């Protein structure tokens, strides 16, 4: 019988547990599990982007929980007038609730959906929240998203910040259920490059391992680190940072003598594994600008792929209201960011090539050599 | 000032309009726009999977709206006791509300989130809903998701079905704002192959163009259609359909003399452009089974990629509760479907090769030739 009683409305966080795929991704291969940490980290990084957080401490506890402490402003603790409970509880228990739906609290933020930490809460057998703010320490415990008591003052403090510790639910997560130090370290190291001046610590209470990430030199240094084990073919890393028409575009890149292409794209410090409009705009501008240079200099045929070979690049955009295809933010689907990246790249890359002739001639040589190798491969295939 | 007044809860469908990327995808390149149609179509296809719908009519109207009519059971019209309005209105106005959170109404369905048509409604300047059910015709109009009046009986009928017509909001959709016949036709043709016995019609009132898709022969015929403009190298399409351990696995495939790999994956008739665990399980089983055969027959080194070359395959799984990484369902993230596909493929592909020696020897030859071409390409690159 298919009728009005067949229609069910999922309330609170029930939808997250029912359909975890669309909120956290793969609950079996470990990617979703670690994404739980990243949602919490991203919220602390947003306090850092806002200029309020200078230290983030991530700890893997010996009981397989993870905590993230920041020294930001603290999650608001006061009673939310409409909802009638602490704003912190609203944040933790309500989907599409948060402080990033305008630019008053965070001018630019990786967070935008009002979903992330409420997902972590929904999918955690236990979550502990400690907030330092307005001279007071506040604490609350959740179990499978359900607050055990209202947020309560437990003492006094001169400090501000938020600590979230969570124990993932094994009713949701399967197979890969332990946290992997290196997965967290990779992301935190990257975040240090992306946030100069923010101390990021990782501590593993299981074996005593720890790291302190506080790189200077930003995404240019990130490119150096990424080319460390490789062989850069020219010495001057191309770098710029601009802010035009509301959009920040920061790019660093350098070619090596290998044959892989590694372009790391970020939007408000969140990586897009699956690329997007920023990547599209980067590729379009590289192809145009190199072709223009080779034409002008009489080095001209090479395609976009030949320029890709041996390339390491970091593309980091800052966008007031970006659009991602999912909660996990693997792909940027904002057409105006393609235009911004493409335009800034076309201008500044052309200038780089004019200002650094030694590097330009090396890169042209590399593109030519890639095109020659591609044609030889093609001819060899045809002939078998 | 960052405090409890900074925290905002988005209600009703406001979150969909605020953050359309995570609900419909790209609102500028036309993919999201057409996805609006596909959400409505998928709901009608689910009535077909349930055995209640035998005809679906998709119409592109001259005012740039689209309608989808089905002859299924009809969206329930009775008052929802908890919500206090028609179940149809709950469906249209509430996220994570629907009839696919258990298997009582639809044993297997592409729909699972309780989100799709409410998104279409949220992002439409106008939506018209007409439901035929329990001897009555019911109608309701929405504007930007807001019902203009409660669902009302407008007359009598011996028929059942649902008609949704929507006019997309240009406050959300930009650039590509007109519907493209061929985009809809591709998907509807595919759905006809996937749903033998369901008549699917497409009509364009702008120019009078129409199609009637009612292919027989299922996914085997789909493979024929896909190889039509190519040159199959062996005559017997590998095909099976099984249902084991709660999971349906249906595969058809055939090699052609070209060099592309085209594997079309589906879960409950919804395509995964970005692949997933079904694709992973398919690839794993092809590699194992071909290698085993070549070893046994003394034809053995070829990798998984060499088997990929010239391959056309359709992989269609039927899953009680699949997991997708997003509302647009581009990627299947269900580890148990990898195991089911891999296991069924290993068994039945091995049998196919034993039963069809002429085809097996041709395919082995092709894999060998691909491996030879790959090595020649590699050697040619190294030598430049
Ligand atoms: N560490 C923190 N410090 C201060 N405020 C925080 C912190 N973590 C969360 N918040 C607040 O809680 C809100 C909700 O967080 P969350 O559910 O993660 O959604 P979001 O960050 O807004 N967006 P998203 O992560 O993309 O879903 C944020 O918008 C902030 O207002
Ligand atoms: N054409 C239809 N015929 C009958 N029932 C329908 C039809 N369209 C929608 N429904 C009902 O409306 C519910 C909500 O649809 P919708 O918001 O699209 O979510 P869903 O189909 O359940 N899941 P999803 O599409 O993955 O978000 C469905 O689960 C059905 O119960
Ligand atoms: Cl407050
Ligand atoms: Cl009813
Ligand atoms: K939230
Ligand atoms: K719905
Ligand atoms: Mg967040
Ligand atoms: Mg649906
Ligand atoms: Na914002
Ligand atoms: Na179901």
Numbering used by the authors:
A (entry chain A), B (entry chain A): 4 to 303, 309 to 392
Question: Which lines from the publication concern this structure?
Answer:
The focus of this study is the ATPase domain of Escherichia coli DNA gyrase, located in the B subunit, which functions as an ATP-operated clamp that captures the T segment prior to its passage through the G segment. Evidence is provided for the existence of two monovalent cation-binding sites: site 1, which preferentially binds a K+ ion that interacts directly with the α-phosphate of ATP, and site 2, which preferentially binds an Na+ ion and the functional significance of which is not clear.
One of these, solved in the presence of K+, is the highest resolution structure reported so far for this domain and, in conjunction with the three other structures, reveals new insights into the function of this domain. Indeed, during refinement it became apparent that two sites occupied by water molecules could be convincingly remodelled as metal ions. Taken together, the evidence indicated that site 2 was occupied by an Na+ ion. When the K-only model was superimposed on an anomalous difference Fourier map calculated using data collected from a similarly prepared crystal but at a longer wavelength of 1.91 Å (K-anom data), the highest peak in the map corresponded to the species present in site 1, consistent with it being a K+ ion. As a result, when K+ is bound the interaction lengths are close to the ideal value of 2.84 Å (2.81 Å on average in the K-only model) proposed for K+—O distances. We therefore propose that in these structures the species present in site 2 was a tightly bound Na+ ion that was not removed by the cryoprotection process. Nevertheless, the values for the N-terminal portion of the ATP-lid, including residues 94, 97 and 100 from site 1, were noticeably lower for the K-only structure, and to a lesser extent for the K+Na structure, relative to the two other structures.
